[PDB]
Design a protein around this ligand. Structure first.
Ligand SMILES: Cc1cc2nc3c(=O)[nH]c(=O)nc-3n(C[C@H](O)[C@H](O)[C@H](O)COP(=O)(O)O)c2cc1C
Length: 353
């Protein structure tokens, strides 16, 4: 197949294999309530085979950025209904990315509380976007019973996404956030049932996945991974065995899809993870029209998610079909509530009259 061929993914027939990657934009602002501009933004992109939302924290403890939307409250759930209505009114399909940042945050975003983690080990470098610039804090290690609290927050988030009219949920198991912190032996030095073997390190991700499956059915659950461990101070002494284990466990659960942020190189685990998973595999990171087509024709991926191209190109599917020029993304308006429509809902389409 090629990028334009349909694909069945769980209980959905995608009309094409162009996916919108999850993209944090912070256009909700300090109430965390989704708004009509966010609804318009996803509706603009509804020609996608599948849309994935921006990461959505399942609890205030999972907030890493000012202006993120939430999925923990009824008022947030009501606000998301506008977004799913907008997408469904344009005949699109959308999953919510459900999220907990763990140690990748700052007490000023958590009402003075420490971010939480499997282990009291700070991420390297500075908190993104916050001024003045400051290092990540040493996080607070969860008790064993507080890990069950995290799973419950994921379950309730999966429930609220369902009440908000989503077609499914994708777990943010990627980019050094909480599930990835638990998964990798660089960040997880626990000695309870959540540390000290690949089985134990994968347990939180797989419990969160099982919570989502109980709400949605396996067909309406995806899991997002970053097997190169190249963002937010990640690292594991055997990435092939760690990610292989996750892929095989999710495959035994027959979930809708695995997605991965992982650019193509000789060291890519994607083809091995796709094989171990046995289901739909959505690749991502630095793909273009030709490399997307070549990867799908080679059976290396079933579909391709685009991040920065979908920021700048609401009609990306039509532009890729036409081999038309792409709008250049403006990184200065990727993030920030203040921006409103600017660099959000105002990128041009090919249409003129
Ligand atoms: C502004 C911006 C925000 C992002 N927010 C998220 C996020 O919320 N969840 C996530 O899993 N990845 C997030 N990513 C990563 C993208 O999903 C994607 O993996 C990355 O942009 C690489 O794909 P690309 O080369 O097509 O852009 C974000 C990337 C950008 C540029």
């Amino acid at each position: 197949p090629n990028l334009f061929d349909p694909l069945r993914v769980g209980d959905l027939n995608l009309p094409n294999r162009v996916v919108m990657a999850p993209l944090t934009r912070l256009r909700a602002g300090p109430t965390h309530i989704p708004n009509a501009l966010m609804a318009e933004y996803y509706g603009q992109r509804a020609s996608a085979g599948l849309l994935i939302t921006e990461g959505v924290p399942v609890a205030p403890q999972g907030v890493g950025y000012a202006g993120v939307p939430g999925i923990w409250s009824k008022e947030q759930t009501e606000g998301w209904k506008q977004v799913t209505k907008a997408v469904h009114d344009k005949g699109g399909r959308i999953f919510m990315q459900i999220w907990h940042v763990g140690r990748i945050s700052d007490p000023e975003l958590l009402n003075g509380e420490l971010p939480i983690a499997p282990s009291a080990i700070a991420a390297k470098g500075h908190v993104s976007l916050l001024r003045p610039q400051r290092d990540y804090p040493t996080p607070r290690a969860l008790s064993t019973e507080e890990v069950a609290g995290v799973v419950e927050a994921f379950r309730q988030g999966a429930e609220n996404a369902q009440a908000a009219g989503f077609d499914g949920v994708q777990l943010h198991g990627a980019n050094g956030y909480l599930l990835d912190q638990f998964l990798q032996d660089g960040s997880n030095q626990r000695t309870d049932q959540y540390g000290g073997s690949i089985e134990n390190r994968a347990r939180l991700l797989l419990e969160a996945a099982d919570a989502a499956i109980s709400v949605w059915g396996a067909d309406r659950v995806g899991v997002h991974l970053a097997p190169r461990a190249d963002s937010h101070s990640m690292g594991d002494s055997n990435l092939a065995a760690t990610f292989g284990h996750v892929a095989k466990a999710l495959g035994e659960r027959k979930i809708g899809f695995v997605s991965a942020r992982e650019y193509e190189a000789a060291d890519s685990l994607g083809p091995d993870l796709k094989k171990a998973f046995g289901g739909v595999y959505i690749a991502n990171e630095k793909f273009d029209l030709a490399s997307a087509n070549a990867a799908i024709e080679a059976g290396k991926a079933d579909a391709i998610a685009f991040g920065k191209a979908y920021i700048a190109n609401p009609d990306l599917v039509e532009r890729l079909k036409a081999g038309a020029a792409l709008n250049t993304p403006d990184p200065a308006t990727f993030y920030g509530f203040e921006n409103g429509p600017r660099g959000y809902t105002d990128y041009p389409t090919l249409a003129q009259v």
